[model samples]
Target: TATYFQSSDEHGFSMYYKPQVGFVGNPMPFYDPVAKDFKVMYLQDYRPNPEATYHPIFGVATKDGATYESLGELISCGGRDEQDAAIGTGGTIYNPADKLYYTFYTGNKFKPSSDQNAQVVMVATSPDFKTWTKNRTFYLKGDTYGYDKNDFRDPFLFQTEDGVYHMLIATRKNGKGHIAEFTSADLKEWESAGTFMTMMWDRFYECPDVFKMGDWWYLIYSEQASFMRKVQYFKGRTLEDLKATTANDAGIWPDNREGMLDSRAFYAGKTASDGTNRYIWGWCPTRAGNDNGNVGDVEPEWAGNLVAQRLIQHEDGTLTLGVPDAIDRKYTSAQEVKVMAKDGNMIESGKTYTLGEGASVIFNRLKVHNKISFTVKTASNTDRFGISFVRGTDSASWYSIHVNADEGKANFEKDGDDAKYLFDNKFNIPADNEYRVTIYSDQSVCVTYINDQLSFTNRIYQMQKNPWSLCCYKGEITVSDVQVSTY
Candidate 1:
């Protein structure tokens, strides 16, 4: 099984999954103790009529986190105009006392209401995993709980260490985003527990998730604010402790702040652990093109393929991400290629080589999808250099990762006829330190990691070719131990 999982098609269409015919969103995975496998419940986006859209919850099972089998649709809307005409993101938890699975989700309608499209939390129960029954007696209204009527959704349910049930929902109050907390003693009735964690910004927190990792309780959520759109995390000793502190004031020392799960191409991520290892799942959006009546359009469509990455927690309470071992193992063999330096400079393989300003090296015969790794060192404090992948021999079209040490930031840039943009992200690196970089390129999807300190994901539609190059723009750099492997 390959760890790199995506829908077969590129146009936001996935087979054998609900919204099965269209797209995927908000994946919630649970470990089924009875079946000894993982069951992932995801919200599906489908349109049965031209006037309305339906978001139903669907299930898929996977034992190894790589291979998935569809379980069909588990819940659906009553009608196109009924409440829950659209089901937003939610979570599932199994109660031991009642031996039933409880699914808490967001339900909303579009017609005839003071709070048009106001969302409320709804509940359903299942004796077995197959059939579910809606619980009419229990409903948590959003407007009554101080949340903006249309801003409540993505209910995350869990049990605390002391056996108390808690639900964290994505909501807003006073024009700022926060997670509203609720407590339930019997799983039927609930009471407000105030805000779980308040964000500094005034944007809606979408698809919130909370889980315990090691000695830390981590709260993760996605914020699609106008300035930024990415999945972020906060850590604390207890859930109550997490709620007391604000986003900028959370996390441990040295890294005491919100940690990003991945770059922009990955969105609305949630996590699941099988009592051992944890994995984060999200969707990679597709590029809008001829499918929607445009050819040169590069804007991302609503939702696309499912992307899953293994979460690696460090001893210092920080995190690193990578493809699963299952997926990496598929690249069994490596291809040795000589590095050619421009201006007739001698470049030796397996030896340290220095490149000054205006100096560059090209690695030819690159594959469309490749796994490239190398160790590099900057000779000066203000050096600017990085690699360009899927580049053309003429240098007319390419994608490049530019590291600006002077600014302590990295930029993902693409230059071509179809798509061209630069995405900038900040990171800290001491001067003249050795940084190991690993890059995974699968067609337009590209993920890069820098010394396990930062990771960036981006899409580059211009790179239809396989040649790559490394360059020094500002100062001098030394590169060695370059290796490339193809899947």
Candidate 2:
């Protein structure tokens, strides 16, 4: 069997930044000011070995599609007795005051015997982009603050509008996960500003990121919590405004709507911008069973592929994510998919393919960097229709890109009522006869963008030799035009 892609270039909806033998850990993305390009440094997973958890943080400079300048090893983890014995997720920031880049990350020394402060914030600095020096004497200990020491990690550093550097560390307080805030006048010394954002439940947050765009401040964190497992955020005009909105059982959302940035397949998303465009870079794990598309009840394993979601900030200060422009622009040349087998009255005309009730048309899978666009017309508001990735004559693809108009839901899910999903979101189809569907699949990751407004992203592991379909569950649907484009 093949590994989960061993390079840093995909150019499809998803990007891969990995070492030859390992997968992605928590990817730390930032804009390289000096180089004027995007740089991502992430923990590479070697697992159970010397290099797996304690090796150097790997990096790559992402340029145009498929063009990545490799910046091999960066920061090395410390000795077993020191802080950062096992390196964890953190971030890097270039301080203009000193012309130095400082990385604040977590260190772990898990004592098999008893409980101790296993996690602490560790520091490192660099003058040039290539070399780094560990600050062994400096440590940001969280145990003294009466928080869970073992859970302390994912410290995200950001400079506030007041020129004060603020670091948000992921920790636990009173059994609930809290983003602990500490303000630093200088790089070394920090003043605890108390808990910034707290969950009202037992689950913790990971990879806490806070950034401001236009008129809003957005705080993003990955929820690998007990109740939910997706990236969520809180947005408001001020920090107090963000704190004013409490998160509880129903889960966190901006204005309590369109909450999750992506489905569960994407994790540990951290964002960076060069002033104009902002993107959240995360990872989609490879499924455990390699069950093509169906895991039944099992979830994905560890790090798989690097996925980037370019932020689309709405006019009202709310946000959704979409495909990046450079990657989107590559699929300009159209190709034709010859139908192998179809069922139940597929009206093949001009550029249109119409399907009646219980109808499905199967064709060959598009290439790796591929895009398919079609406009759907359904006669009823309660109709159900979709497309599936299948194995030739198979009726399903485990998870199908589908829509149930009556439920106002757009989903990528399995069949039976007990079926699972890569995505399920509240998406209302328009009352008009036409709704647009655009899908991009690159190197086993598919991002289905609907009406250019909302999108569902999933990792497609079976893109090698599988076929796909245009399906209709009930009622009549017509796709006015269908076209596949590739790079």
Candidate 3:
């Protein structure tokens, strides 16, 4: 069921795979090769009641990525008026030299009397993942860091080859967002390393992550701008060089013209590798209105279902993401559904198909957890051809994939009184050549791949009935070798 691993409460909370159990925030994951276990720590959300007093950090352990065992809460809010009435995002790391696990998080406190909140960076220590000790003396006050006090949060920790510990925090100064760097000889004491990377924009960069992949060092962060609540990344040879480059110069894919980890529905995603494969984890947001009895009238809010994608790096240093094989392999049954196009209609597999401009051929048997694969060819450059999935009985509400051969682009749109688009990406294909297309749909999420050249991941909430169709707009196309399967 789609509810697998989904929240079963009124709060509608979901989570990510970080080796530990955290809530609505990043999960800092640690892998133990000898035991084949992952230890993850994350910030927990305690909401719904306006007067809730605490936001806690929790812990969980997982042997495989799919099954998790909770270790309960590790850190709790001091009190309602305490510095950590609410906790922001952070990360955890284990230092072999000290034989202790270090956790750095943002502590937020709301003052009812002053009608204000304060955000600061704090640290905790654990000899084992089971218990934690808050180090109140090791806090970094946001106001002293030269950034807007409220803008400082989401601490990321990493160690270099030289045995130096580095901390990166998402903060802003002089009206622009940047990651501030700090160096600690011991995890206890830190010294400012100056501005790590200056993002000369007004948007606050959240969830900063830095890691070395092959010969490249990549810096990733998320932005909460009204138009862009997505993850962006940069790659360079060294951390120093990476910081000097701007987002425009460091972006990866399509010549860095436009590159993102996923669409806005996937937010605050971070990457981790289990020494063999890499994966990015984020949340699939659900509508906040549903909790308030308003249903489809409002936009989806943060902290929904946990979504994971396998990361593939191309030879040219770009990246592509797809459903993890572990999850995809669950679909094991195959069913052949024959489809044909007619003169007005034609007959194939004992079925007649007739589709014209704005006309569609419906596939009524498929449901939410099916995979569709086909080979298609088109001869016209200016023609618009595509498929629509998860349609309602009225057919007006659906998720459509539109291929614009004339512009070498493909778009994913949501149909309604007003059409909503989630993806518009440029791709190249020969007009006369046949392209292999595959799509996977599971509950509210859908992922599509074309000729191994492009991929799109999307979330559509209204497709429970699962009626799909193929159609064209001012275009004609031939499709063959069609197959659908369920896992």
Candidate 4:
């Protein structure tokens, strides 16, 4: 009878739900230039778990792990409108109009005739990035012409070169994939273009996103089905014309890989462009495979988390996935610190430092104000290995970044709940032997590197106020070439 929702904070990862857990849902991410940090804001439904019933707010983490701030009630759908009372998962976009950010999602109870549970598209805008006002609840109700009655949600919008705007909504009609099209001139008022596209999947489609690269246009969405659903994609030209030109056969994507956005366990991919930079954010699910029968049975009790990625449109029309390097270089200092293992201590397989068996080195009396980097070498077969910083001898508390050779991935976790797998397959080490792992920590953000090839950046807050330590798990392994620098 208990459900759990998990999220990250300064103190590490925490879960709350019916049994007094934390929030569930992806962290809505936004940048605060004046504050020099990134803010994650999202909807936290606490009615199902009153003990953890915290209203929606913006959770902020800086480059340094010393500070973590949460600005609560930043935006609330609660007002006179009955429909705005219960808002569900929605996508947010930054609007240059009026110098405010706009968030579009579906709401229940806003429309009288519609099912209270049926989601209706809604809009909210904010200037300071905190307090938001629900400008309108039902932007394009289904009752309008050329629209389906139920299942319309996740409105994603963007501007065009002609100074016009477009929005793609997840919808379906008569057992087909549901993708609705709408146009706007002023960013506020909108006119439904028609049913843009649909899929043959048996269940409903969710999170529709459209973007343009050179002369090609890409459309992406998620499907909700009895089994695991995938994020799908399509290509065309002219948002309006693409809908009219494609027939029933060509409308549905034939092969999933042709337009596949990501091969990982991510869902609901959303994309945006600032003309110069195009970015994407998707749902990173902790529950996958047969480990748990359904999403509800996932560990740590969190349903979903956000995975942010930077999009680069190649000349050949392929998009390369990465994070902004500026974010990494910004925190690193000019000073470079490197440490290498003893000649006999060279890193190799079957040699790991088990609990107290590993080599312990202390970088004494060093002041780290902003950024620092640490590098180490290990054999490729080493499955469970990591470097721990700001740790205590008690083993209960410490800030650690783990490298998993088996899964070929790395993660940063706090409070022992490594539920949020922030990055995957970021490092490519030769399947042979020893590879290098580098870690950069600046301000509140942390970026981990593998063999100097793959990297993952994450935000965390550490509170132990203790000195740092580097440790390797199990067996006998040699750690060499250690370095830390400030930026």
Candidate 5:
């Protein structure tokens, strides 16, 4: 349905988006005021051919935050001699003051020598979102600003509420990865504002983004500069406060929720808003092998289907992701889920269950694949309670898709012998002792959205048909309304 995706059989994502042909990488999201759609300008991988392995900036627009309408190629790669022989991830903005839409992107020059710069920021102008002209004269080479020439890219341009334009670039200086800032009075000429923030972990903060929500300024980036592969964020009252946060001192629980949106499954996260609700847009990569939960064994294909999560901001300036309003509405048709008590007593049929220490119960699949939701309340906190998929009584689920309210954490993992972590993040449960968990799954792709407080994107393979069960050990939890829903 207007997508380039070839088939939905091998690795289907019924709700997540991908093209019928190629995949999507490093999504650059922007709201088109004139067209009134949330448009994503992404680095489209036109590959599988040896001689023409280059990416052009392509465009897609979404009306309801669920589906996309392709706008084809908005910007192309440069000639062989040009710096952007291949394009990379970047940002886009529409300035009414100039009646123009300006895109600042990365130009990847596959030069022969180590001394030559590998990347730089390039600019293109468009009157409408569709047409574009390369302003070859407009470019920003970061070496003059003390940025490593080979490392400068992913130019993120955002206008603050005060109408000031700030551009953040991913670079390295002082032996640390930095999100360097550039300020512009108009949307054209930019002046170096110095280091916006630094990540002490020594990994490039790829595809950096900055925005203001309420009184907090938020920094968003993906760190798949390989090993640090995930989408992370930081928030503060000002740029300096935002700058103070590094991978070293942040990500503590109760105060902040790990400073991340999703785990290794999500990457190149960018965001946009319609003056009401904002959403984080990113791509979930496809691994080459069929091995489930084997994170380090397979080489990823780099780009895959598009996944978006709605951001919910807490009063303390922390953020979590929930299901987008449209998708929540789309999957509202209720289906009966059979709840079979494995270890616990059924307090009330499929509605309520009383679980003592080391108790569990399994649930049958829905009429559809699955879009399950349930309420979790406990008498006390525990580290060893959550959900997992299994073949009746087998531990074939491998990893547990669960949470530890005692430690304010959630992820898909297996503990004790043969521990494996495919996805992980920190999240706090409410004081009322309730965790409203929702899981959206189709084929291998699944996202565990918890209480509109945290979200974890996961890959459930090999055991997708396995029944799921809740387990609480050394603590008591009452699970209720264990049901599934659909469109």
Candidate 6:
């Protein structure tokens, strides 16, 4: 892991991290089913540190429906001056005319303290995904129309078939989470259509994307700007009439805790569609905590990566996440092996074996699928216990179901990526307790359960290829059952 953050003397800001690599993309290019191609692009900072050389901060990735290859340095955020340094930063893309890809990004001054640089709206275009050319400054500084010019940036561009280009910029009008709406005839200069929507306390509604699903037009954006959740979806009759309709406030199903999109820590989510299906993707920061914390050094040889997930819309208009089935192409299959608990005697802690206990069980060549399930029982919360069903090498990298003997909660995690904490249950099974647990993995998707109780569903993107071994640690657990399946 190396440090991706860099301080620059030229622009007075450093790239916080390197361009992330992974394709969980939103506002993804419209997938051409007839051509069997999906187009997607992403924004990546060129250098981590602000005090570096030649600052053209952003770049894009192009995918030929299957694999992704990025074009280096698509657009620069800003230049040496503090005024334009804030330009080319936050943005979202949309297929306004069905065949043309348009991007609406922010442009303004980069003040040291206040977010005063959010001043103008910028545009860029790409007709065929190859050559990207700048459009024009669609909207600029103005408060005469009630939109805050200082609180503007992250322009989300969209167009109706009737030839009206709609722009939702991150701004605040009269202290509400305002999305400034503007319409354009030539996809360049915009005319203020008034404040399209607004919210309370949530000052910066950044990275806004709006579209139509069925009869409802959905407005999606990130909140707080400093520390926020993933994309929040608001629905209305038209772009001119949407509001923050939360799950709790609206009594909508699948709105857990605070009407969150997903339980895991996700941010900066955007939405895209392929006519037949809609997709949501965002940047998942490997470095945790609020914006004040330093982005820790990337592991010497490794840069930061992206956690892309396919958005699954449930029957109730709520959304769930899953790894797309296209990830199955990465695996090579082998013979299947099954384990069953026959003796009915549960495995306990402190049992030692000469063959390394459960660690010696050899797992044949297997392809990692979208879902993997493991079954076992734990006796005590103090049982420092977990079973590594798919161990790669040593004790570091494997798919394991971890039960913190001291915590009384089960966790699901991959070996190389971050660990995901599942649910905590107060019930403590006695020593020699036997229960069943299952672990599932797909392209960046995972779920685990204990005795049919849903414990956790995680998102990870660690395994490059799949062929794993089985092992156990700090406890004696009977190797009851293990199964791996492809999507």
Question: Top lDDT: which candidate number?
Answer: 5
Reference-based lDDT, residue 93, model 2? 88
Candidate 5: tens digits of C-alpha lDDT, residues 1-487: 1111112334334467666667777899898888888988887763462242378888788876676787888998888767888888888888898888999999888663676778889889899787899988877888889998888999999887788898989988877787889999886788998988776565667888888888888888787555558788777788667777774545422245457678778888888988888888888776556444556643345776678888888898888788788766667677767665466543554468767666777666433346888888888665446677533554533457768777777767763256676556777677787888888765556678876777887665533455667777657788887777766
lDDT measured at residue 136 in model 5 versus the true structure, 0 to 100: 81
lDDT of 6: 0.46
Local accuracy of candidate 1 as per-residue lDDT tens digits, 206-252: 88888888977777777777455677776667766655557653433
Q: Over the stretch 406-472, how does candidate 6's per-residue lDDT look in tens digits? A: 6544444453345443322222343455555544444333444444322343333333133343444
Tell me the lDDT of candidate 4.
0.49
In what order do the candidates fall by lDDT, top score first?
5, 2, 1, 3, 4, 6
lDDT of 3 by residue, 54-125 (tens): 547765665444446776788766676767777777877778887788888888867533434367889888
The TM-score of candidate 1 is 0.84
Q: Where does the lowest 10-residue lDDT sum fall in candidate 6?
A: 8-17
Task: Summarize candidate 4's per-residue lDDT along 1-487 as a digit string, tens digits.
Answer: 0111121223222111011233335444444444545555555534253221223433443332123355555566554355545555565556665677777766655444544335567777788766788775346665464455566666776677898777777776666656777888877788877777655435566766666767767765665653435455566555554454245555544132334444334555555544455555554443333122123432222334344555655554444445444444444445433222222223333323222234443333223333444334443355455555544344344455666666555545442333333333334444654655544443233445454344454333331133345555533445554444443
Q: RMSD of each candidate?
A: 5.1, 4.0, 5.1, 9.0, 4.7, 9.4
Residue pairs of candidate 3 with colliding backbone atoms? 19-39, 19-40, 20-40, 331-487, 332-487, 342-345, 342-346
lDDT scores of the candidates, listed in order: 0.68, 0.72, 0.64, 0.49, 0.74, 0.46
Taking all chains together, each candidate's TM-score versus the true structure is: 0.84, 0.89, 0.82, 0.57, 0.86, 0.62
| Arranged by TM-score, best first | 2, 5, 1, 3, 6, 4
Error of 2 at 260 (Å): 1.3
Deviation (Å) of 167 in candidate 3: 0.7
lDDT of 3 at 379: 51
- Greater lDDT among 1 and 3 belongs to 1
Lowest-sum lDDT 10-residue window in model 5: 1-10
What is candidate 2's CA lDDT for residue 196? 87
Give the residue spans of candidate 4 off by over 4 A: 1-24, 27-41, 45-71, 79-81, 91-102, 110-117, 126-130, 136-139, 203-205, 213-216, 220-269, 274-276, 282-307, 330-487
